[PDB]
Design a protein around this ligand. Sequence first.
Ligand SMILES: [Yb+2]
Ligand SMILES: [Yb+2]
Ligand SMILES: [Yb+2]
Ligand SMILES: [Yb+2]
Lengths: 33, 33, 33, 33
Amino acid sequence: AEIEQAKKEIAYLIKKAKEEILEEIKKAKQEIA
Amino acid sequence: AEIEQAKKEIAYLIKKAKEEILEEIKKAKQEIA
Amino acid sequence: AEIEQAKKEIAYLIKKAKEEILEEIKKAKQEIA
Amino acid sequence: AEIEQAKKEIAYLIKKAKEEILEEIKKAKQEIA
Ligand SMILES: [Yb+2]
Ligand SMILES: [Yb+2]
Ligand SMILES: [Yb+2]
Ligand SMILES: [Yb+2]
């Protein structure tokens, strides 16, 4: 089930990227405001 | 049509990530400026 | 060549998301600083 | 191994996008705060 495996891997990369970006926006906000 | 289904799922994850990130930038902007 | 087509479509979505997010960070920066 | 190649290409695009966005948040932070 390689198609599904590739999708799973991509989804995990998106989930990690999203979370790190949201964290960094929030932490910048907290530093400034 | 598994290839298309995987693409659809990935596209939805990107769309959600994009929207949440843009929202959080705008809300930070509004808090500061 | 459906695999390649799906990749092309995903790549375009990432490129649009990246560009919009970078634009919005820069415009927020310009408003504040 | 086209499925794996497409996954590799997508992963690289995500990695570049993530890194550029995180850099730009940090640099904005540094300019303001
Ligand atoms: Yb987190
Ligand atoms: Yb929204
Ligand atoms: Yb642009
Ligand atoms: Yb870097």
